[PDB]
From a paper:
Giardia lamblia is a pathogenic unicellular eukaryotic parasite that causes giardiasis. Its genome encodes the canonical histones H2A, H2B, H3, and H4, which share low amino acid sequence identity with their human orthologues. The NCP is composed of 145–147 base-pairs of DNA wrapped around a histone octamer, containing two molecules each of the four histone proteins, H2A, H2B, H3 and H4 (5–9). The H2A–H2B dimer and the H3–H4 tetramer are assembled via packing of the histone fold domains, and two H2A–H2B dimers associate with one H3–H4 tetramer to form the histone octamer at the core of the NCP.
In the present study, we determined the cryo-electron microscopy (cryo-EM) structure of the G. lamblia NCP at 3.6 Å resolution, and characterized the stabilities of the nucleosome and histone octamer in solution. The overall structure of the G. lamblia NCP is similar to that of the canonical NCP. All G. lamblia histones adopted the characteristic histone fold domain, but with notable deviations from the backbone human histones in the NCP, including the G. lamblia-specific insertions of six and two residues in H2B and H3, respectively. A 125 base-pair DNA region (out of 145 bp) was wrapped around the histone octamer in a left-handed supercoil, with a mean RMSD of 2.01 Å from the canonical NCP with the same DNA sequence. The DNA ends of the G. lamblia NCP could not be resolved, whereas these regions are well defined in the structures of canonical NCPs, suggesting that the entry-exit DNA regions of the G. lamblia NCP are more flexible and accessible. We also noticed that the lengths of the DNA ends of the G. lamblia NCP that could not be resolved were asymmetric, even though the 601L DNA is palindromic and the assembled histones have full dyad symmetry. The H2A C-terminal hydrophobic residues from 111–117 are important for the H3 binding in the human canonical NCP, and these are replaced by hydrophilic residues, including four charged sidechains, from 108–114 in G. lamblia H2A. This appears to weaken the binding of the H2A C-terminal region to the H3 αN helix, and thus the H2A C-terminal region is not resolved on either face of the structure. In the G. lamblia NCP structure, this insertion extends the H2B α1 helix and L1 loop. Surprisingly, the shape of this acidic patch is substantially different from that of the human NCP, because the G. lamblia H2B insertion forms a ridge that deepens the acidic patch.
Numbering used by the authors:
A (entry chain H), B (entry chain D): 28 to 123
C (entry chain C), D (entry chain G): 12 to 106
E (entry chain F), F (entry chain B): 20 to 97
G (entry chain E): 43 to 141
H (entry chain A): 51 to 140
Amino acid sequence: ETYATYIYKVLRSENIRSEADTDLGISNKGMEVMNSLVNDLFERIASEASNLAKISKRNTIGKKDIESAAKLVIPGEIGRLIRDEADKALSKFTSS
Amino acid sequence: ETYATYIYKVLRSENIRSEADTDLGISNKGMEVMNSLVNDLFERIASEASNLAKISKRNTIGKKDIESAAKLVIPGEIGRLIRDEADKALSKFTSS
Amino acid sequence: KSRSARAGISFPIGRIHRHLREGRYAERISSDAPVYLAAVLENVVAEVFREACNHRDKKSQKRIVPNHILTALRKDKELATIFANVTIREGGVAR
Amino acid sequence: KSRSARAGISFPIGRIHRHLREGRYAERISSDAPVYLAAVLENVVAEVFREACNHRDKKSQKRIVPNHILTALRKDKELATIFANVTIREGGVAR
Amino acid sequence: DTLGGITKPAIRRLARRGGVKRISSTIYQQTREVLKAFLEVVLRDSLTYTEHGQRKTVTSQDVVYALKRQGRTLYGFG
Amino acid sequence: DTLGGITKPAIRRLARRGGVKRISSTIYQQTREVLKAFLEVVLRDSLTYTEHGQRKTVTSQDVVYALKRQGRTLYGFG
Amino acid sequence: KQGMVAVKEIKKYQKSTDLLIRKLPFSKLVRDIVTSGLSKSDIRFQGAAVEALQESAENYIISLFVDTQLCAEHAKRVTIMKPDMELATRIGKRIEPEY
Amino acid sequence: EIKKYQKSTDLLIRKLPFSKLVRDIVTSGLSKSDIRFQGAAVEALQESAENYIISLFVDTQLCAEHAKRVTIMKPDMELATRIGKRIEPE
DNA sequence: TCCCGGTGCCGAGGCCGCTCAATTGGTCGTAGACAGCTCTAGCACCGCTTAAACGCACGTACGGAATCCGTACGTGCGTTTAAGCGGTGCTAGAGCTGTCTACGACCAATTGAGCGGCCTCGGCA
DNA sequence: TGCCGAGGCCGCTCAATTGGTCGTAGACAGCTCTAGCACCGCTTAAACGCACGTACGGATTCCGTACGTGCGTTTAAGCGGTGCTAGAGCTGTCTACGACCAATTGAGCGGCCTCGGCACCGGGA
């Protein structure tokens, strides 16, 4: 139960405009590292969403909670960029 | 929802062994600090017990989990003493 | 009669059990879990008070104010590792 | 037309939703939330890959290995803040 | 006119309690812009914990949580 | 003796990657001792995460959980 | 005389527990940073929130000065200097300033 | 050499003696006999230990440079262990 | 400067009574303990094959001690400032209750993307 | 130069998806009234700035030795080997235990009062 294929997909999608001399495949160990990074960041964001739910005293972690958790876990300029592209994805998903 | 009265009780009980034998009241600010200490340590032990349950893949946090969490949060000699006196309390409670 | 009193503890097994259940720490909380957790918390508070008293007897202040607690936490080696990242309101500094 | 395809994401909306449930991060999980979380995770991965390439294009090795991820994590201040405490396996040290 | 609030004798007092004896002149500006960076981080996380609760009055619970976000837990507020 | 197994050149390697030039002959022993203290903390927490699993082998995930417990999250072991 | 009141100062400020930074200037800094740096506006600070901010920030600066005096005393010096604070900020993984 | 070791990623503390170290520490200070170490576990533990000591030496060289010195010495490591929150020895 | 006798303030501490949370017994259901089986992986001794550690010689470059000068930083004083108070006056909004409803859990059915298993060929040793 | 691992195909399968109900979590609206803000003058202590001079940082030399480097010799780390099995892990039964419930009730909270410790103060030593 690993995010191997999905990380491959995001790598390919980002690379369709990155250095296109070749598809910059990720080495197995690098795949393990990225998989563990996704798991660690997902646990961090989900744990912050849990704490934010318990704070606001709600049984559900809505979009508000994952957004505040992404603003806590992933701060700074990259945090705004990632949450903005996440809102883009969410708007695209809900309008369908 | 504070552990004020209980901290009073334990303070009085610990005075008994101590040669000081003073009522040894705790100042309001000190009372708040001890209360927040109990809440922080309870959150730490219960969170570690949750993580230990999720690790061992069990839906219940038994005595095993709270003991391992107390062995993680509170390590060392004071940790062994506290887990031992806690096992004393639990044995006394269960034999009734 | 009451679970806290029966166990020989001073801490509320009932309140701790309620906090465990409503804190969503797990779906179930085995009946032994709150009694043991109450005992552990009770003994930690007893240990902190003991250290505050031993470091206090020189200062001989009858009460226990946050500075004494900060001294107890910052002096004992094990307690220092337990509460390394613990600031305390009106904590002062541990000499 | 799964949810991953619908949202423009490549990350598994379903798998993230399942993990969010079985992890018991909360009682309920509004099915609008896993979409956002998967998007944030995909964007983070894309950003880390983007900065690995950004800092490595000089080498032109045409492959990402844990050292590349280490330098990407520990060069730019935002990622350095996110993953300050991380220690990549077989990573090495940032150039 | 913001860090000036953290006046030179304030850093003097802070550092005397900390333990130092003689304080250079650059230390004042450097500790002002270290305290300001610490407050930037803590207040970013605290404003997040507030704006999430759909509030605008930053509570001391929000501050305690924003600090606990950086491992520094406060005892004596909640 | 076992601790002395961390050979002096191995410590010189560790420190050269850390960017040192000349290593006073007392740094060897102090590094051995801080590494032993680190491993005592991490191995106590790893043995606790193991003993809780009712098993007698400390697995990679036990060590990773111990390190997460003390602060250093490891990436790339599970 | 150049160090006669330094010991009195250190003892007086280590025996007490008050808040060192004056409360209104620190509160002014907190409101200024919330509006200037963050750009968020019309945010109201609960009194206890400014109090916990001030207590934690001054305790962080006090620990920074402990670590700075350690750095100085290690450099066989007596006067903490900007290199001393920069080391106590880089070694202990504190929040480095912007620039 | 600083370059060869800095850029590579190959382990630094020899695997077998460090394995003996971790096994002895668990079997002596912790005193839990009959403890069996998964190979991955000792590998991860060694990776973390060498990474932590490498960061300790980074901070030691920082403190040395700060003392207008070129040779790191025991006071420098004590400072880089005290200023950081690293685990002080026993 | 210490070390202590009065003084007035206030917070620990005690008593009450209302309340809500703790406790008890009974059903009922199911989580986990416990055993039984399967074989992965750890472990252990062994013997080569090195490559790393080691121990010493050497000598040089660096730590540290010792001195010297300049200036920067502490101390003190008079002047200026604004922190703090506290007291009032204003309203935003935090928060608590109640309502109503959109949404998620759950089940039943469906369906296809993802897993390992297997292959191959070009990047690399 | 060939060899194997990143990447691609294959077929099962299990997890994702959808459709519908029900109830319930929660978004909202309305009301309360706490408390944060603002503001002003006054007190006054705290900050500021400047004068002054001591002492500290740092700049410099210089000697001792504690470093790195460079050999050869010794070693134990690594690896491949098989063999040995504790024990991890997966399953399948069940029962000891926890959730849930209503009813019982008494521990715990706030409200109110008090008096002894202590901040203060002034004295004395």
